[PDB]
Design a protein around this ligand. Structure first.
Ligand SMILES: [Cl-]
Ligand SMILES: [Cl-]
Ligand SMILES: [Zn+2]
Ligand SMILES: [Zn+2]
Lengths: 119, 119
């Protein structure tokens, strides 16, 4: 991929991913990590880590959002969607993001506040 | 990860992973790839690629087997288990194998027929 500029329009979706992180940790579904998948300013999936709830170590926020978006759209590809993550994805989730063909990734960053990557 | 020797006892488990690859492609669940997870000398998950069946790009053979094993054992870690794959896992599935804390991987190989990696 290649790094991109973060836009004002990304703010609301990154914030919502953090809201998901709060909802998830608060109710015990998993660690405080959230992910939102969007298509043309419309939220397709809004999820958080579900490792504890599902007894599933693959149920990270990003993987969960991809599974939900693909089921909702009835597609195994998301080339017209983008994903927002409350923090940087792990190697497993980067692999899922690539396999899913997501077009763009924005995640919360400590040094830069937020980072955008186009694929 | 460190490379290990492949044992005679690995044969029956690797073969079953390949049998899963055949069953999967035969019925159209997904690509010809299979994975087997073993716990205390018993198969706790015998799976193949389910991308087409589940409409899920994360539903590779290794991910599917990890999900089934964790749910059957009611654990999010598989440190006493080993995984067998019909061929080398992809980056996403390697990430899942690491996250699941599986202790050993054996996969089919072309130049050396099989490879064992200890974690
Ligand atoms: Cl996560
Ligand atoms: Cl696979
Ligand atoms: Zn992850
Ligand atoms: Zn894979």
């Amino acid at each position: 991929g290649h790094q991109q500029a973060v836009l004002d329009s990304d703010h609301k979706f990154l914030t919502q991913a953090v809201e998901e992180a709060y909802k998830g940790v608060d109710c015990g579904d998993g660690g405080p990590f959230g992910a939102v998948i969007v298509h043309k300013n419309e939220v397709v999936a809004s999820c958080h880590n579900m490792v504890l709830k599902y007894t599933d170590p693959t149920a990270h926020a990003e993987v969960t959002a991809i599974r939900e978006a693909c089921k909702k759209l009835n597609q195994i590809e998301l080339s017209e969607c983008e994903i927002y993550a409350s923090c940087e994805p792990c190697p497993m989730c980067f692999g899922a993001i690539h396999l899913s063909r997501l077009k763009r990734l924005v995640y919360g960053a400590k040094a830069e506040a937020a980072i955008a990557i186009g694929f």
